[PDB]
Paper text:
The simplest TCSs comprise a sensory histidine kinase (HK) and a response regulator (RR) component. To address this question we have used the TCS [name]-[name] from [name] as a model. We had previously shown that the HK [name], a member of the HisKA_3 family, undergoes important conformational changes to switch between phosphatase- and phosphotransfer-competent states. We now report the crystal structures of the DesKC:[name] complex, trapped in the phosphatase and the phosphotransferase functional states.
One using the phosphatase-constitutive mutant DesKCSTAB, and the other with DesKCH188E carrying a phosphomimetic substitution, both in complex with the REC domain of [name]. (D) Cartoon representation of the DesKCH188E:[name]-REC (phosphotransferase) complex, along two orthogonal views (left and right subpanels). Note best fitting with a one dimer DesKCH188E (chains AB) to one monomer [name]-REC (chain C) model. The structures show the RR REC domain adopting identical conformations in both phosphatase and phosphotransferase complexes, presenting active- and inactive–like features in different regions of the protein, arranging the RR’s active site for phosphoryl group migration. This loop, acting as a phosphate lid, is open in the phosphotransferase complex, enabling the transfer reaction. Binding to unphosphorylated RR positions the P~His188(HK) into a suitable orientation for phosphoryl-transfer to occur through a loose (dissociative) nucleophilic substitution. Taking into account that phosphotransfer is a nucleophilic substitution at phosphorus, the reaction coordinate distance (i.e. between phosphorus and the entering atom, before the transfer reaction has begun) strongly suggests that P~[name]→[name] phosphotransfer occurs through a largely dissociative, or ‘loose’ mechanism: a reaction coordinate distance of ≥4.9 Å provides room for a fully dissociated metaphosphate intermediate. The small number of interactions and low surface complementarity that we observe in the several DesKC:[name] complexes are consistent with the observed ‘slippery’ nature of the protein:protein interface, displaying significant shifts in the relative positions of both partners. Further supporting that this ensemble of conformations is functionally relevant, molecular dynamics simulations of the phosphotransferase complex recapitulated the gliding shifts of one partner with respect to the other, reaching the different arrangements observed in the crystal structures at different moments of the simulations.
Numbering used by the authors:
A (entry chain C): 1 to 131
B (entry chain B): 154 to 368
C (entry chain A): 155 to 332, 335 to 367
């Protein structure tokens, strides 16, 4: 069973993501947060296998949280709606294992979690310098 | 001489350059709003509908609850996009102007107007009445006149909005062209009820003058 | 001083004026977003409303609808992704690539080394600088007869400073601000920036904007 922490500031989306992932047989949402600090605190203390992280959250961003968790054995997957410039370079430098789109089908998110747990790096083509 | 004309130009050329920068500054402010507004609500619509599909047989009740919020979310997203113009200031008449340009072009009738000289600050009711009358005046040009040109003027004079619709065709009506249940009398009755007026001149083609109080 | 009161009056007039172009811009943006998305969102709504009505009656059709609801959302979001990306203008990193291509195509040596790159500049000020950088280099290509062009882009104190230097010969009159030079100065000054020129050993433009 894969243990997941979800950091997402928009409660509606946070709740929908948790619901979408708890549907999987081999996955479990062990905690939910709305800030980057919530992610740093839970991951350092509870040590889940995976951390699903939004970028822009109040206080500390998911990119800032990812930088603080760079050395911890947790596998971080970034989730964004848009690709603002330099998000990709900052993400890879922080050692994010996944950088996906929030609205990518749920099947693809569960697939990225399994791939990341298998030591793979999953980056949405859309979120890297495209076309 | 007309060296001043070259200077007057020099100025509006500059003014318009500064206008394009305050326009760009707005475009940017709007993208940030959209980025949150639409971006997020569409991201949510996606996930919530994806989950709704996964619960159709599992929990049909939750699938329904999700769909209720997907409809709610979509309905507001659209109304947030209507709200990025927090004025409604002279907008129905501006939309009717687009409709009549399309209708006249489709009919091979030259449309003569001045988009910049159009009033705002009219009541939404009186604006909607004028839109209706403008539509009818132009429907009449297309159906009856056999005009090659149609000229629309919209002027805010004192406390009336005056619209004139002129065409260079030939008037086809009888001595008294105001008949029960049809456009000319219909426009007059609706305008008069709003304490406005409708006048017609059928000498050199047909010209309708419609006026309504500001409010 | 009564001068403070006058500046109030000048600021109000400039804001009153600005608001008429802003209100016009909004009116335009709105009509066009409602064009490309106003049906798609209305469709998502109906299709999801119907899928809810079929959940128990025809769960198969509810699924089919949902597949569609889902598809029209993904593409709408993708459209938006494009629209916002477009509304944000020429990024300075992208303009730098354009000027390298233009100078190379013109057989002019391009000299640039990244130093003190701006960490955060407003999208507006970035777009203004992109426009000025493009023009400075268009002028080098069209008029200078230079063999070399040196561009420096640095965050110095509370400004972003861009210098465009060339080793050609300046072709303008004593007062060359009539067009691009006056255009750049006016656009920079509107942004509380500045444009200076040195035409001794070729032509050197120094442009600064707050940041
Ligand atoms: N622009 C125009 N040029 C020439 N004749 C016109 C005209 N507008 C109106 N007329 C004439 O006056 C008549 C009366 O117009 P009116 O608007 O009352 O009814 P109508 O024929 O347009 C049917 P309805 O408006 O209900 O669709 C028309 O049938 C036509 O003969
Ligand atoms: N880098 C450069 N090298 C040589 N001459 C230059 C130059 N930049 C500008 N000039 C001179 O200054 C004049 C004014 O420049 P400016 O950019 O304002 O107008 P222009 O002649 O390029 C028309 P526009 O800029 O609108 O395309 C040019 O006509 C040219 O003589
Ligand atoms: K589970
Ligand atoms: Mg009629
Ligand atoms: Mg020029």
């Amino acid at each position: 069973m894969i243990s997941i922490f979800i950091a997402e500031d928009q409660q509606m989306l946070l709740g929908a993501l948790g619901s979408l992932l708890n549907l999987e047989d081999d996955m479990e949402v062990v905690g939910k947060g709305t800030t980057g600090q919530d992610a740093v605190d839970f991951v350092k203390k509870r040590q889940p296998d995976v951390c699903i992280m939004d970028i822009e959250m109040p206080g500390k961003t998911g990119l800032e949280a990812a930088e603080e968790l760079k050395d911890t054995g947790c596998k971080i997957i970034i989730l964004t709606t848009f690709a603002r410039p330099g998000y990709f370079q900052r993400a890879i430098k922080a050692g994010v294992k996944g950088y996906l789109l929030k609205d990518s089908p749920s099947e693809e998110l569960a697939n990225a979690i399994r791939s990341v747990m298998n030591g793979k790096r999953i980056y949405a083509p859309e979120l890297m310098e495209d076309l | 001489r007309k060296e001043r004309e070259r200077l007057e130009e020099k100025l509006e050329d500059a003014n318009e350059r500064i206008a394009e920068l305050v326009k760009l500054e707005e475009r940017q402010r709007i993208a940030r709003d959209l980025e949150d507004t639409l971006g997020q609500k569409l991201s949510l619509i996606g996930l919530k509908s994806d989950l709704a599909r996964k619960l159709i047989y599992k929990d049909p009740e939750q699938a329904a609850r999700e769909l209720k919020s997907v409809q709610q979310t979509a309905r507001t997203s659209l109304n947030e996009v209507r709200k990025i113009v927090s004025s409604m200031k002279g907008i129905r008449l501006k939309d009717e102007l687009i409709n009549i340009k399309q209708i006249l072009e489709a009919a091979d009738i030259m449309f003569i107007y001045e988009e910049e000289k159009w009033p705002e600050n009219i009541s939404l009711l009186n604006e909607n009445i004028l839109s209706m009358c403008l539509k009818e005046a132009v429907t009449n040009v297309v159906k009856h006149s056999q005009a090659k040109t149609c000229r629309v003027d919209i002027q805010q004079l004192w406390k009336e909005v005056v619209i004139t619709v002129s065409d260079d065709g030939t008037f086809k009506g009888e001595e008294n062209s105001f008949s029960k249940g049809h456009g000319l009398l219909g426009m007059r009755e609706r305008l008069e009820f709003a304490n406005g007026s409708l006048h017609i001149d059928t000498e050199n083609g047909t010209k309708l003058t419609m006026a309504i109080p500001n409010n």
